[PDB]
């Protein structure tokens, strides 16, 4: 209730340069983001805690009962800030400082071990990372493979000519119409 | 995010949100469908090859000079000389004020992976002709390959060999003019410039829309409780939730229009690379301006750039015919 | 193998299954979306009229008409979006029939993967299925080639084909099938000297 300001959010020490009679702090969205504390000249910026989107990696429920959790765009040492009870709605504390932690360009995911081979992509993650449920079964995270490497023996007096042929039949499915509805 | 955008960090409003209920969940499934599609548009264009070829060390392709489009190993990023001019010509605290549940997800394919697909297309289309897009890749000298590109236009193959040195110079000269032309002006990259401008402007109006009263007593949620009686305060707060829910709806609807337009353009780049790049096109004014010979792809931020090579008749003379 | 390929895995027909899965999902949300209150006394429509008199009942009833009148408008708008992308796919299947089925296509990678020969249409619920037949080269060899040949001080060029040599003496073949032939004035045309 700082001199008539009501809201919610942790208070952190800030070092912005105010002016002799500048009390409030206004952001682009016209919301408070800084307050001059009464009885002091201190300035505190009002922001929530370490927050973002929480995603769950999982195979089918029937296949297994295991999950992996990815926090989007957070430093991997700033996630264990809220390992407590009555502090978070999510109290699953074994996943914060838990299994093999691997840091990606989209935050660090916990519960999957990073192997350093490469296969095709099964469950996309982001920035060239994919996850799969391989074998003794556990979830792993690897880097995508673009395909099999190859090289052509180019020369200025060499040509290659086929001597046989194969015939293949391929399918292709296209939608053409949908259901008619009246209300 | 549903809850944090409209009245984030206020538990006295979150229970009020359950009254409307499944309205915002429809928005999440709408925006998530757009994001998944963007990862398929890129896949259809650059991933038309089952092999990752690489060029041999020798760079004598019959006199043609391809050094301006092949990757440069010296640079930390394996991007060609031309591709560097494009990355420095597209301009993208701005994202720090997005604590309202607005996020920018990262693309599935990193920009260093797309340059590997593009380098495979180039290294397979100069050592094997068009034969790698219809089966096993078969090598062919570049000097002879250009003879079957003239032969498809309608000009015999005895004119390329008799003018091989002159044709090589014209190709090399025109390939160095593009480098200076791109760095001369800045309006050539306009098509990709407004794609990111529209998205940045759309989010800005969304953020500024939560500072509007919507005709109510006060914009901020906290003082409404402290300035009105509890018997009728619940009427005013839901009268403010409607505006913050309609505003989020117009943003989603506008994106659905834009996504279809980009989808119709990502289906044209896939055709332009199947036909012009992996073959020779007889369609007029499709892969350039004139008689088509070949094309080369290049990668740009959120797009692709083609380099069409054509054939144009020079000075002519009148005649009498029967 | 086409019959057994489809009958093995059921995920091949996912392009038609999600078209009918999406329409059913849109109606289910619309039915469940009239249980909301929109800030009124209750969702039951005639409970307002049986508990309040005419002077504040109109405030509540209007708060519910516009709420339900806005969930219909949202449903209609999405259908206009969906119908405009099914139509963009019905103009693609109408072209594959006119070009791949009713003729032979020279556009590459349009009617299959390889050199197109001929296609057959088949009908599926709310869609169409094409059976493209293509031609693919099998195992190959490699020879030594030459751009031209000089015999009487004059160059010779192939009329249709390439020059190859199996190690000792030369031949002329096709470009898509190794069928060697002897060099003849019929196979070649002369143009200028050979320097
Ligand atoms: C490259 O192709 C040439 C042409 O086919 C090959 O030379 C050919 O070799 C056969 C096998 O000896 C010769 O056939 C012989 O013909 C005589 C004719 O009287 C006959 O008496 C023998 O019993 C035998 O059938 C054929 O004449 C000869 N071609 C020519 C033009 O002389 C050559 O072997 C091939 N090289 C490689 C490395 O495969
Ligand atoms: C070209 O390939 C075909 C198969 O793709 C070859 O035909 C096979 O030949 C063997 C030889 O004994 C038979 O056992 C197979 O039954 C044949 N396959 C079929 C489908 O009939 C053919 O021989 C090859 N031609 C050349 C010149 O190598
Ligand atoms: C292909 O063209 C490039 C120019 O785009 C040539 O690179 C130049 O080479 C000359 C002489 O070798 C140098 O004086 C220039 O400084 C080079 N310029 C650049 C930008 O590198 C290159 O040499 C040509 N290819 C070949 C095989 O000569
Ligand atoms: C259980 O899930 C698996 C995939 O995880 C699926 O193949 C199987 O059909 C499912 N069984 C059911 C839904 O009864
Ligand atoms: C996370 O913080 C640590 C501590 O400074 C830092 O070393 C690391 O680079 C950070 N991770 C990032 C920025 O992705
Ligand atoms: C691959 O295995 C682990 C994966 O984390 C890694 O530490 C190790 O150094 C790698 N070994 C080789 C040979 O690449
Ligand atoms: C092919 O290139 C090499 C390397 O420059 C050269 O030595 C050779 O003579 C060339 N072959 C022909 C037929 O020109």
UniProtKB/Swiss-Prot annotation, chain A:
Residues 80-99 are annotated as: Disordered. The cytoplasmic Cys-rich domain is palmitoylated. Palmitoylated spike proteins drive the formation of localized ordered cholesterol and sphingo-lipid-rich lipid nanodomains in the early Golgi, where viral budding occurs. Main component of the anti-COVID vaccine Chadox1/AZD1222/AstraZeneca; in which the human tPA leader sequence is added in N-terminus to enhance protein secretion. It is found in: Virion membrane; Host endoplasmic reticulum-Golgi intermediate compartment membrane; Host cell membrane. Glycans are attached at residues 62, 75, 116, 135, 156, 164. Changing residue 163 to I: In strain: Alpha/B.1.1.7. Changing residue 148 to V: In strain: Beta/B.1.351, Iota/B.1.526. Disulfide bonds join 76-108, 121-130. Contains sequence and structural motifs very similar to those of a bacterial superantigen and can directly bind and activate T-cell receptors. Activation of a broad T-cell repertoire may be involved in the hyperinflammatory syndrome in acute COVID disease. Belongs to the betacoronaviruses spike protein family. Variant D614G has become the most prevalent circulating sequence in the global pandemic since April 2020. The mutation is associated with higher viral loads produced in cell culture and animal models. It would not change pathogenicity nor neutralization properties vs vaccination. May be prevalent because the mutation increases virus transmission in human population. This is Spike glycoprotein. The gene is S. The chain holds residues 542 to 736 of 1273 of the full protein.
From Swiss-Prot, chain C:
Changing residue 160 to K: In strain: Theta/P.3. It comes from the Viruses. Residues 17-61 form a coiled coil. Glycans are attached at residues 142, 166. Changing residue 169 to Y: In strain: Theta/P.3. Disulfide bonds join 100-111, 150-194. Residues 1-38 are annotated as: Heptad repeat 1. Subunit of the fusion protein that is processed upon entry into the host cell. Mediates fusion of the virion and cellular membranes by functioning as a class I viral fusion protein. Contains a viral fusion peptide that is unmasked after S2 cleavage. This cleavage can occur at the cell membrane by host TMPRSS2 or during endocytosis by host CSTL. In either case, this triggers an extensive and irreversible conformational change that leads to fusion of the viral envelope with the cellular cytoplasmic membrane, releasing viral genomic RNA into the host cell cytoplasm. This is Spike protein S2'.
């Amino acid at each position: 209730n700082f001199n008539g300001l009501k809201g919610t959010g942790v208070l952190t020490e800030s070092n912005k340069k105010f002016l002799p009679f500048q009390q409030f702090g206004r952001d682009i969205a016209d919301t408070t983001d800084a307050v001059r504390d009464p009885q002091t000249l201190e300035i505190l910026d009002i922001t929530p805690c370490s927050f973002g989107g929480v995603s769950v990696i999982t195979p089918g429920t029937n296949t297994s009962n295991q999950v992996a959790v990815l926090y989007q765009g957070v430093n991997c040492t700033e996630v264990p800030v809220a390992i407590h009870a009555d502090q978070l709605t999510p109290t699953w504390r074994v996943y914060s400082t838990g299994s093999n932690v691997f840091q990606t360009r989209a935050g660090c995911l916990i519960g999957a071990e990073y192997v350093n081979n490469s296969y095709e992509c099964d469950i996309p993650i982001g920035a060239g990372i994919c996850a799969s449920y391989q074998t003794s079964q556990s979830i792993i995270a690897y880097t995508m493979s673009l395909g099999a490497e190859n090289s052509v023996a180019y020369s200025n007096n060499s040509i290659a000519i086929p001597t046989n042929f194969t015939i293949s039949v391929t399918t292709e499915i296209l939608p053409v119409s949908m259901t008619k509805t009246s209300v | 995010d549903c809850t944090m955008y409209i009245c984030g960090d206020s538990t006295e409003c979150s229970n009020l949100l359950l009254q409307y209920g499944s309205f915002c969940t429809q928005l999440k499934r709408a925006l998530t469908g757009i994001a998944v599609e963007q990862d398929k548009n890129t896949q259809e264009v650059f991933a038309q090859v089952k092999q990752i070829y690489k060029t041999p060390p020798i760079k004598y392709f019959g006199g043609f000079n391809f050094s301006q489009i092949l990757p440069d190993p010296s640079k930390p990023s394996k991007r060609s000389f031309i591709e560097d001019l494009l990355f420095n010509k597209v301009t993208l605290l701005i994202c720090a004020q997005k604590f309202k549940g607005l996020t920018v997800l990262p693309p599935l394919l990193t920009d260093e992976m797309i340059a590997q697909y593009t380098s495979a297309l180039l290294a397979g289309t100069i050592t094997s002709g068009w034969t790698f897009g219809a089966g096993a890749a078969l090598q062919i000298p570049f000097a002879m390959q250009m003879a079957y590109r003239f032969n498809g236009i309608g000009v015999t193959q005895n004119v390329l060999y008799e003018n091989q040195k002159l044709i090589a110079n014209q190709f090399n000269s025109a390939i160095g003019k593009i480098q200076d032309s791109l760095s001369s002006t800045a309006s050539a990259l306009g098509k990709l410039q407004d794609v990111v401008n529209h998205n940045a402007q759309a989010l800005n109006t969304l953020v500024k829309q939560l500072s509007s009263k919507f005709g109510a007593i006060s914009s901020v949620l906290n003082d409404i409780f402290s300035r009105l009686d509890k018997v009728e305060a619940e009427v005013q707060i839901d009268r403010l939730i409607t505006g913050r829910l309609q505003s989020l709806q117009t943003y989603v609807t506008q994106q659905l229009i834009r996504a279809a337009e980009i989808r119709a353009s990502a289906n044209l780049a896939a055709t332009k690379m199947s036909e012009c790049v992996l073959g020779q096109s007889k369609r007029v004014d499709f892969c350039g301006k004139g008689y088509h010979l070949m094309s080369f792809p290049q990668s740009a931020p959120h797009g692709v750039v083609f380099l069409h090579v054509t054939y144009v008749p020079a000075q002519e003379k009148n005649f009498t015919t029967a | 193998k086409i019959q057994d390929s489809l009958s093995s895995t059921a995920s091949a027909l996912g392009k038609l299954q999600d078209v009918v899965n999406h329409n059913a999902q849109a109606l289910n949300t619309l039915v469940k979306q009239l249980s909301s209150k929109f800030g009124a006394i209750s969702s039951v429509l005639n409970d307002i009229f049986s508990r309040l008199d005419k002077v504040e009942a109109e405030v509540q009833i209007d708060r519910l008409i516009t709420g339900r009148l806005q969930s219909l408008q949202t449903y209609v708008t999405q259908q206009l979006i969906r119908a405009a992308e099914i139509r963009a796919s019905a103009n693609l299947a109408a072209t594959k029939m006119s070009e791949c089925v009713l003729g032979q296509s020279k556009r590459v990678d349009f009617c299959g993967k390889g050199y197109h020969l001929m296609s057959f249409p088949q009908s599926a619920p709310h869609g169409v299925v094409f059976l493209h037949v293509t031609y693919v080269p099998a195992q190959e060899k490699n020879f030594t080639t030459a751009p031209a040949i000089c015999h009487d001080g004059k160059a010779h060029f192939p009329r249709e084909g390439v020059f190859v040599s199996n190690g000792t003496h030369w031949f002329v073949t096709q470009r898509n099938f190794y069928e060697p032939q002897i060099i003849t004035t019929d196979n070649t045309f002369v143009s200028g000297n050979c320097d």
